[PDB]
Structure 1
């Protein structure tokens, strides 16, 4: 009902950066060139000392240029509407990289903050519902983070979707994938591998080769990428079956 910013933004941000730098993803992802306090300054100039709605997609540009890590070939995952499953399956960078394993992704994941014109330059009480803010403002941070990450992808990329939502198609132009990732994929990308997630016990809404997925197949091949698509592949199925052993789809 009121939307409360994260406490001690700097401290938390600097805390994760430092943790990350020294101890996270060591063999999986490169360290980045800039120190944590340099990263803080690029992050903070993007919103401090302006209205909370006073942002666009240029705003965090310098932050993302500094934070961008080269990303391992064939490992990049995108996801829509399946945060829990896509992450369980990407298994913390072992099998796939998500945006949330990346430095910027990790530092800001789940955090809430916004600017205010008066000192200390950010609000510590309340943030607006970002439905009140123009889209470029609401989406300045994660939108650009998605774009920067997709622009760094190389080789085969993977896309996990929900193909069980009757209200939300598997693929949409209007998702973060559809707005910021698919169209920023460069000619170092060779293939989009789609994994459709049919939630256990639920009506199958979207199918490979049909509907929004066919719309995507087309978008993909039109970008010159190879394309494939699987519906609950054994590896993913088992993972769903772990949280719902009895589900008919998991029968021994």
Structure 2
């Protein structure tokens, strides 16, 4: 995979832009300056092998880049990137990880280290599977954990429930591994929104399959649990894209 060109710059520019202009109302600014944020990020993967990472490689970056999150606005999504980010609305309805400083700066970027100077590879990064999961999940799983760990109030998990190959709730999913295990008792309630993609076949129901295994685990973890499938606001959102869908007549 050819990595992001001018990572230093893209990173520093997404950081300045965010700093001076992004979720001014919504999120808090971080206290570290962009360059400090760069040393910590860079010191995490540089001069090592590309697959030479584990969950704790970016600890220092996340400690520096972590913002206190707005009460009851936190949202986790799974299998519904657009629907979930379209619904959260830029921090308006909710905040997703990609609205937080770290999610914003590194979202979609490809980077990897190497031992030789410059300290990182700007020509080629190894593919997926090549690396072990924790080297593969070193950055984003750590971002979720840090993010899940900062949630307070009701927490929302929007999920795909019209997929016959991937159940709404899975243990070995970022949610089952990084986000739910990291929810602190500042968290009061896990609200799940099941997404039934218009047109298609309904696979997951609340109070039924893995949404039932999740229901019990959540309460076992002492949080309250609410589940809804295609609530109206998400349905209209979904209809906007497919007006002429039967679910959308009126």
| TM-score, normalisation: structure 1 | 0.99
Give the Cα separation in 1 of the matches to 2:225 and 2:77: 16
**Of 161, 173, 177, which residue of structure 1 is paired with 2:175?**
177
Q: Deviations over 1:100-124 (max 9, x none)?
A: 0000000000000000111111111
Task: Please state how far the C-alpha of 1:129 moved relative to its aligned partner.
Answer: 1.1
Task: Please state how far the C-alpha of 1:247 moved relative to its aligned partner.
Answer: 1.0
Give the Cα separation in 1 of the matches to 2:240 and 2:217: 34
Give the Cα separation in 2 of the matches to 1:22 and 1:127: 32
Task: Please state how far the C-alpha of 1:134 moved relative to its aligned partner.
Answer: 1.1
Give the Cα separation in 1 of the matches to 2:128 and 2:183: 27
Give the Cα separation in 2 of the matches to 1:219 and 1:85: 26
Moved over 4 A (4+): none
Q: Unpaired runs of 5+ in structure 1?
A: none
Higher mean alpha-carbon deviation, 63-72 vs 242-251, is at 242-251
Q: Deviations over 1:181-207 (max 9, x none)?
A: 001000000000000000000010000
Give the Cα separation in 2 of the matches to 1:214 and 1:129: 36
Task: Please state how far the C-alpha of 1:231 moved relative to its aligned partner.
Answer: 0.5
Once the two structures are superposed, the pairs formed by residues 104-119 of structure 1 within 5 Å of their partners are 104-119=102-117
Task: Please state how far the C-alpha of 1:130 moved relative to its aligned partner.
Answer: 2.8
**Of 1, 8, 25, which residue of structure 1 is paired with 2:6?**
8
Give the Cα separation in 2 of the matches to 1:136 and 1:4: 21
Q: Unpaired runs of 5+ in structure 2?
A: none
Higher mean alpha-carbon deviation, 240-249 vs 145-154, is at 240-249
Give the Cα separation in 2 of the matches to 1:43 and 1:208: 40
Structure-2 residue corresponding to 1:80:
78
Q: Tell me the C-alpha RMSD between the 2 structures.
A: 0.5
Higher mean alpha-carbon deviation, 156-165 vs 125-134, is at 125-134
Give the Cα separation in 2 of the matches to 1:173 and 1:75: 24
Task: Please state how far the C-alpha of 1:126 moved relative to its aligned partner.
Answer: 1.0
| TM-score, normalisation: structure 2 | 0.99
Give the Cα separation in 2 of the matches to 1:57 and 1:208: 32
Give the Cα separation in 1 of the matches to 2:25 and 2:224: 29
Q: Deviations over 1:84-106 (max 9, x none)?
A: 00000000000101000000000
Q: Deviations over 1:12-51 (max 9, x none)?
A: 0000000000000001000010000000000001000010
SS of residue paired to 1:58: helix
